[PDB]
Amino acid sequence: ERPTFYRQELNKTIWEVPERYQNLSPVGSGAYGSVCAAFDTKTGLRVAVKKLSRPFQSIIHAKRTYRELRLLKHMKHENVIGLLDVFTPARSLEEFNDVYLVTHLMGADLNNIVKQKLTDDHVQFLIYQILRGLKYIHSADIIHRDLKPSNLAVNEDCELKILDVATRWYRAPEIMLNWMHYNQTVDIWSVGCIMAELLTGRTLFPGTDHIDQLKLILRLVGTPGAELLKKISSESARNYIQSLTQMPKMNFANVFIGANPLAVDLLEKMLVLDSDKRITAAQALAHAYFAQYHDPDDEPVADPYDQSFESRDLLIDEWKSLTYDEVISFVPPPLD
Ligand SMILES: Nc1ccc2c(NCCc3ccccc3)nc(-c3ccccc3)nc2c1
Ligand SMILES: Nc1ccc2c(NCCc3ccccc3)nc(-c3ccccc3)nc2c1
């Protein structure tokens, strides 16, 4: 049962979509693709339809498209963005050019509430959901790597989704230092930064560049111990650190003053410089700060995610075809 498509131009771009999606309203664009709000006549839900910009321009782009399609197809959890549909107007591989992704429409992102400073209880729920999302994603051996308020969608219900304001502000220091072997807890660092911003109303580490980013972080967290330097493989990294003016750790209680002690303690456990000691998503969920939300029965892990393709050097048409297969094999999620 192949659907019937109709065309239309919105802001310099042709959209060919299945009749099922109606009233396409442009709501944004970037170099990755553009998005319209739509009414899905099949489910009666408001959706976002994304049209990938230039999906198969180069090997880099084609391998990006396939990766985006693969991640979205895998995500099946209430606190992570998922895929209601994916389609193409093409009737065969040979004419396959365009990729459209469909997803629930979301009310606003986390800035559209940040810019205002939330009550403690809202902070609990918001950060709860992010961690609950993170546990899932991390369980699948996937790292977000770019968590920040603009990548978090929030309803008027305060229901939060992790989606696919400078990035650098929320980057774990070991990414700033260019470490190749960072773990999942780079996301926990970002959660820490986002959490601190919801409590105080202010960006914790609003650095002008990477050097400055490091200066501000170290001002709160202190210069590394014996034990941390003991574990840096990189000679220049190691000497930069020693090079710098030894900052002592701040007492977080003296920084986020007025904030909930249980909040200050989770921040302590999230914003540790040494990512080996940093609290994990699973562990953070069981922290008492989320006493009123935590439920180990209702914090599911994910199916394993096959990442073997990342190591594959293939041709554009090959990525193109693999993508084509992922388009075809999509099974829509079971309805409301
Ligand atoms: N970091 C972001 C920021 C904004 C985005 C955006 N914006 C449209 C409004 C919307 C916001 C939140 C949820 C749905 C819609 N749409 C999409 C998207 C759409 C369809 C398929 C895959 C991805 N991703 C976004 C990722
Ligand atoms: N077990 C670990 C644990 C943490 C690590 C870490 N994280 C802190 C980075 C940092 C510390 C102090 C000030 C700014 C940033 N960085 C590095 C590292 C960095 C660069 C090149 C090679 C390796 N290795 C780590 C090995």
Coordinates of C-alpha atoms and ligand atoms in Angstrom, one line a residue:
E1 CA 0.0 0.0 0.0
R2 CA 2.0 3.0 -1.4
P3 CA 0.6 6.5 -0.4
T4 CA -0.2 9.5 -2.5
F5 CA 2.0 12.5 -2.4
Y6 CA 1.4 16.2 -3.0
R7 CA 3.9 19.0 -3.7
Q8 CA 4.2 22.6 -2.5
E9 CA 7.0 25.1 -2.2
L10 CA 7.8 26.6 1.2
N11 CA 10.7 29.2 1.6
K12 CA 12.7 28.3 -1.5
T13 CA 12.1 24.5 -1.0
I14 CA 9.9 21.8 -2.6
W15 CA 8.1 19.5 -0.1
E16 CA 6.6 16.4 -1.5
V17 CA 4.7 14.6 1.3
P18 CA 2.0 12.0 1.8
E19 CA -1.6 13.4 1.9
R20 CA -1.8 12.2 5.5
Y21 CA 0.3 15.2 6.5
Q22 CA -1.6 18.4 6.1
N23 CA -1.3 22.2 6.8
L24 CA 2.5 22.3 6.6
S25 CA 3.8 25.4 8.5
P26 CA 7.5 26.3 8.3
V27 CA 8.9 26.5 11.8
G28 CA 12.7 26.6 11.3
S29 CA 15.8 25.8 9.1
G30 CA 19.6 25.3 9.4
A31 CA 22.3 23.6 7.2
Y32 CA 21.2 20.1 8.3
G33 CA 17.5 20.5 7.0
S34 CA 14.3 22.3 7.5
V35 CA 11.2 21.4 9.4
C36 CA 7.4 22.1 9.1
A37 CA 4.7 21.7 11.6
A38 CA 1.8 19.6 10.2
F39 CA -1.4 17.9 11.1
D40 CA -1.2 14.1 10.8
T41 CA -4.7 13.1 9.7
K42 CA -4.0 9.5 10.5
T43 CA -3.3 10.0 14.3
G44 CA -4.8 13.5 14.7
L45 CA -1.5 14.6 16.3
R46 CA 0.5 17.7 15.6
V47 CA 3.9 16.6 14.1
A48 CA 7.2 17.9 12.8
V49 CA 8.2 16.9 9.3
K50 CA 12.0 17.4 8.7
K51 CA 13.3 17.5 5.2
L52 CA 17.0 16.7 5.1
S53 CA 19.1 19.3 3.3
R54 CA 21.4 17.7 0.7
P55 CA 21.4 14.3 2.3
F56 CA 23.7 12.6 -0.3
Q57 CA 25.9 15.5 -1.3
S58 CA 29.2 13.8 -0.2
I59 CA 30.3 10.7 1.6
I60 CA 30.4 12.7 4.8
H61 CA 26.8 13.9 4.2
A62 CA 25.5 10.5 3.1
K63 CA 27.1 8.8 6.1
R64 CA 25.6 11.6 8.4
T65 CA 22.1 10.9 6.9
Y66 CA 22.4 7.2 7.4
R67 CA 23.5 7.8 11.1
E68 CA 20.7 10.2 11.8
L69 CA 18.2 7.7 10.4
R70 CA 19.7 4.9 12.4
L71 CA 19.7 6.8 15.7
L72 CA 16.2 8.0 15.3
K73 CA 14.9 4.6 14.3
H74 CA 16.4 3.1 17.4
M75 CA 15.2 5.6 20.0
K76 CA 12.1 4.3 21.8
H77 CA 11.7 5.9 25.1
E78 CA 9.5 8.6 26.5
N79 CA 12.3 11.1 27.3
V80 CA 14.1 10.7 23.9
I81 CA 12.8 11.9 20.6
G82 CA 11.5 9.1 18.4
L83 CA 10.3 8.6 14.9
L84 CA 6.7 8.4 13.9
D85 CA 7.4 8.1 10.3
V86 CA 10.1 8.3 7.7
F87 CA 9.4 8.5 4.0
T88 CA 10.6 9.4 0.6
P89 CA 8.8 10.4 -2.6
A90 CA 11.1 8.1 -4.6
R91 CA 9.6 4.8 -6.0
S92 CA 13.0 3.2 -6.3
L93 CA 16.6 3.6 -5.2
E94 CA 17.6 5.0 -8.6
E95 CA 15.3 8.0 -8.0
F96 CA 15.9 8.2 -4.2
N97 CA 17.0 11.7 -3.5
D98 CA 15.0 13.1 -0.6
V99 CA 14.6 12.0 3.1
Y100 CA 11.8 13.2 5.3
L101 CA 11.7 12.4 9.1
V102 CA 8.4 12.8 11.1
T103 CA 8.2 13.3 14.9
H104 CA 5.9 14.5 17.6
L105 CA 5.7 18.3 17.6
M106 CA 7.1 19.8 20.8
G107 CA 5.9 22.9 22.6
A108 CA 9.2 24.6 23.1
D109 CA 12.9 24.0 24.0
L110 CA 14.5 24.5 27.4
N111 CA 15.6 28.0 26.7
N112 CA 12.0 29.1 26.1
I113 CA 11.6 28.5 29.9
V114 CA 15.2 29.4 31.1
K115 CA 15.2 33.0 29.9
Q116 CA 12.9 33.1 34.5
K117 CA 14.4 30.5 36.8
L118 CA 12.4 27.4 37.7
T119 CA 11.2 26.3 41.0
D120 CA 13.2 23.5 42.7
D121 CA 10.4 21.1 41.9
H122 CA 10.5 21.8 38.2
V123 CA 14.2 21.3 38.3
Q124 CA 13.7 17.9 39.9
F125 CA 11.3 16.8 37.2
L126 CA 13.2 18.2 34.2
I127 CA 16.6 16.9 35.2
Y128 CA 14.9 13.7 36.2
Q129 CA 13.6 13.2 32.8
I130 CA 17.0 14.0 31.1
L131 CA 18.8 11.4 33.2
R132 CA 16.0 8.9 32.6
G133 CA 16.6 9.6 28.9
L134 CA 20.4 9.5 29.3
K135 CA 20.3 6.1 31.1
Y136 CA 18.4 4.7 28.1
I137 CA 20.8 6.2 25.4
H138 CA 23.9 5.3 27.5
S139 CA 22.6 1.7 28.0
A140 CA 22.7 1.5 24.1
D141 CA 26.4 2.5 24.0
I142 CA 25.5 5.9 22.5
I143 CA 26.8 9.2 23.8
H144 CA 24.8 12.4 23.2
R145 CA 27.9 14.6 23.3
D146 CA 26.0 17.8 22.7
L147 CA 23.5 18.2 25.6
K148 CA 22.3 21.8 26.0
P149 CA 19.0 23.6 26.7
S150 CA 18.3 24.1 23.0
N151 CA 18.5 20.3 22.5
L152 CA 15.9 19.6 25.1
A153 CA 12.2 19.8 24.3
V154 CA 9.7 20.6 27.0
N155 CA 5.9 20.7 26.9
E156 CA 3.5 22.7 29.0
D157 CA 3.1 19.5 31.0
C158 CA 6.8 19.8 31.8
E159 CA 7.3 16.5 29.9
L160 CA 10.9 16.6 28.5
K161 CA 12.4 14.9 25.4
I162 CA 16.1 14.7 24.5
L163 CA 16.4 15.8 20.9
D164 CA 19.0 15.3 18.2
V165 CA 23.4 29.3 23.5
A166 CA 27.0 28.0 22.6
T167 CA 27.7 24.3 22.8
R168 CA 31.0 25.0 24.5
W169 CA 29.3 26.2 27.7
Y170 CA 28.1 22.7 28.4
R171 CA 31.1 20.6 27.1
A172 CA 32.9 18.3 29.5
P173 CA 36.4 19.6 30.0
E174 CA 38.0 16.4 28.6
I175 CA 36.3 17.1 25.3
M176 CA 37.6 20.7 25.6
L177 CA 41.1 19.2 26.0
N178 CA 40.6 16.9 23.1
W179 CA 40.7 13.6 24.8
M180 CA 39.9 10.7 22.4
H181 CA 38.7 8.3 25.1
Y182 CA 36.0 10.1 27.0
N183 CA 33.1 8.0 28.4
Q184 CA 29.3 8.6 28.5
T185 CA 29.7 10.8 31.6
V186 CA 30.5 13.7 29.2
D187 CA 26.8 14.0 29.1
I188 CA 26.5 14.0 32.9
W189 CA 28.8 17.0 32.8
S190 CA 26.3 18.8 30.5
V191 CA 23.4 17.8 32.7
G192 CA 25.3 19.3 35.6
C193 CA 25.7 22.6 33.6
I194 CA 22.1 22.6 32.5
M195 CA 20.9 21.8 36.1
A196 CA 23.0 24.6 37.6
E197 CA 21.5 27.0 35.1
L198 CA 17.9 26.0 35.9
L199 CA 18.7 26.7 39.6
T200 CA 20.4 30.1 39.4
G201 CA 19.0 31.4 36.1
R202 CA 22.6 31.8 34.9
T203 CA 24.9 29.9 32.6
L204 CA 27.4 28.3 34.9
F205 CA 30.4 28.3 32.4
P206 CA 29.7 31.0 29.8
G207 CA 33.2 31.2 28.4
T208 CA 34.2 33.3 25.4
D209 CA 36.4 30.5 23.9
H210 CA 37.9 27.1 24.9
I211 CA 40.7 28.6 27.0
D212 CA 38.3 30.8 28.9
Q213 CA 35.9 27.8 29.1
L214 CA 38.6 25.9 31.0
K215 CA 39.4 28.9 33.2
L216 CA 35.8 29.2 34.4
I217 CA 35.4 25.5 35.0
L218 CA 38.6 25.3 36.9
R219 CA 37.5 28.2 39.0
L220 CA 34.7 26.2 40.4
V221 CA 36.1 22.7 40.3
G222 CA 39.7 23.4 41.2
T223 CA 42.9 22.3 39.5
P224 CA 43.4 18.4 39.2
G225 CA 44.8 16.2 42.0
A226 CA 47.7 13.9 42.1
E227 CA 45.3 11.1 41.2
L228 CA 44.0 12.8 38.0
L229 CA 47.4 13.9 36.5
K230 CA 48.5 10.3 37.2
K231 CA 46.0 9.4 34.4
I232 CA 46.6 11.9 31.6
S233 CA 48.4 10.2 28.7
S234 CA 49.2 13.4 26.8
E235 CA 52.4 15.3 27.7
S236 CA 51.2 18.7 26.6
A237 CA 47.8 18.3 28.2
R238 CA 49.6 17.3 31.4
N239 CA 51.9 20.4 31.3
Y240 CA 49.2 22.9 30.5
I241 CA 47.4 21.8 33.6
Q242 CA 50.5 22.1 35.8
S243 CA 51.3 25.3 34.0
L244 CA 48.2 26.9 35.3
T245 CA 47.6 28.8 38.5
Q246 CA 46.4 26.2 41.0
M247 CA 42.8 26.9 41.8
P248 CA 41.2 25.3 44.9
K249 CA 37.9 23.5 44.7
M250 CA 34.9 25.7 45.5
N251 CA 32.5 24.5 48.0
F252 CA 29.3 24.2 45.9
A253 CA 27.2 25.1 48.9
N254 CA 28.9 28.5 48.8
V255 CA 28.2 29.1 45.1
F256 CA 24.7 27.9 44.6
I257 CA 23.7 29.6 47.7
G258 CA 20.0 29.3 48.6
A259 CA 19.7 26.2 46.5
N260 CA 18.4 22.9 47.8
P261 CA 21.2 20.9 49.6
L262 CA 20.2 17.8 47.8
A263 CA 20.6 19.6 44.5
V264 CA 24.0 20.9 45.6
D265 CA 25.1 17.4 46.4
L266 CA 24.1 16.0 43.0
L267 CA 26.0 18.9 41.3
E268 CA 29.0 18.0 43.4
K269 CA 28.7 14.4 42.1
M270 CA 28.2 15.6 38.4
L271 CA 30.7 18.4 38.0
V272 CA 33.8 16.4 39.0
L273 CA 36.7 17.0 36.7
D274 CA 37.8 13.4 36.8
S275 CA 35.3 11.6 34.6
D276 CA 36.2 8.3 36.1
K277 CA 34.6 9.4 39.4
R278 CA 31.7 11.2 37.8
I279 CA 28.2 10.0 38.6
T280 CA 26.4 7.9 36.0
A281 CA 22.9 8.4 34.6
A282 CA 21.7 5.2 36.4
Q283 CA 23.3 6.1 39.6
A284 CA 22.1 9.7 39.5
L285 CA 18.5 8.6 39.1
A286 CA 18.8 6.7 42.4
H287 CA 20.0 10.0 44.1
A288 CA 17.7 11.2 46.8
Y289 CA 17.1 14.5 45.0
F290 CA 14.6 12.5 42.8
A291 CA 12.9 10.8 45.8
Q292 CA 9.6 11.9 44.5
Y293 CA 10.1 10.5 40.9
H294 CA 12.6 7.6 41.0
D295 CA 11.2 4.2 40.1
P296 CA 13.8 1.5 39.2
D297 CA 10.9 -0.4 37.5
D298 CA 10.2 2.5 35.2
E299 CA 13.6 3.5 34.0
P300 CA 14.1 1.1 31.1
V301 CA 17.4 0.4 29.3
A302 CA 17.6 0.1 25.4
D303 CA 18.1 -2.6 22.8
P304 CA 21.7 -2.9 21.7
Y305 CA 22.6 -0.5 19.0
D306 CA 24.7 -1.7 16.1
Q307 CA 27.4 1.0 15.6
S308 CA 29.7 -1.2 13.4
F309 CA 28.9 1.0 10.4
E310 CA 30.8 4.0 11.9
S311 CA 34.0 2.1 11.1
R312 CA 33.1 1.5 7.5
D313 CA 34.5 3.6 4.7
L314 CA 31.9 3.3 1.9
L315 CA 30.8 5.1 -1.3
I316 CA 28.1 7.7 -1.5
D317 CA 25.7 5.4 -3.4
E318 CA 26.4 2.7 -0.8
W319 CA 25.5 4.9 2.2
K320 CA 22.6 6.0 0.0
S321 CA 21.4 2.5 -0.4
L322 CA 21.8 1.6 3.2
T323 CA 19.7 4.6 4.0
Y324 CA 17.2 3.6 1.4
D325 CA 16.9 0.2 3.2
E326 CA 16.4 1.9 6.5
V327 CA 13.7 4.0 4.9
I328 CA 11.9 0.9 3.6
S329 CA 12.2 -1.3 6.7
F330 CA 10.7 1.3 9.1
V331 CA 7.7 0.0 11.0
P332 CA 5.6 2.8 12.5
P333 CA 5.3 2.7 16.3
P334 CA 2.0 1.3 17.8
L335 CA -0.6 4.1 18.1
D336 CA -2.0 6.0 21.2
Ligands
LIG1 N1 17.9 20.4 18.5 C1 16.8 20.5 17.8 C2 16.0 21.6 17.8 C3 14.9 21.7 17.1 C4 14.4 20.6 16.3 C5 13.2 20.6 15.6 N2 12.5 21.7 15.5 C6 11.1 21.8 15.2 C7 10.2 22.0 16.4 C8 10.3 20.7 17.3 C9 11.0 20.8 18.5 C10 11.1 19.6 19.2 C11 10.6 18.4 18.7 C12 9.9 18.4 17.5 C13 9.8 19.5 16.8 N3 12.9 19.5 14.8 C14 13.7 18.4 14.9 C15 13.3 17.2 14.2 C16 12.1 17.2 13.5 C17 11.6 16.0 12.9 C18 12.5 14.9 12.9 C19 13.7 15.0 13.5 C20 14.1 16.1 14.2 N4 14.8 18.4 15.6 C21 15.2 19.4 16.3 C22 16.4 19.4 17.1
LIG2 N1 41.1 8.6 33.4 C1 41.0 9.9 32.9 C2 40.1 10.8 33.5 C3 40.0 12.1 33.0 C4 40.8 12.5 31.9 C5 40.7 13.8 31.5 N2 39.8 14.6 32.0 C6 40.0 16.0 32.5 C7 40.5 16.9 31.5 C8 41.0 18.2 32.1 C9 41.6 18.2 33.3 C10 42.1 19.4 33.9 C11 41.9 20.6 33.3 C12 41.2 20.6 32.0 C13 40.7 19.4 31.5 N3 41.5 14.2 30.4 C14 42.4 13.3 29.9 C15 43.1 13.7 28.8 C16 43.0 15.0 28.3 C17 43.7 15.4 27.2 C18 44.6 14.5 26.5 C19 44.7 13.2 27.0 C20 44.0 12.8 28.1 N4 42.5 12.0 30.3 C21 41.7 11.6 31.3 C22 41.8 10.3 31.8

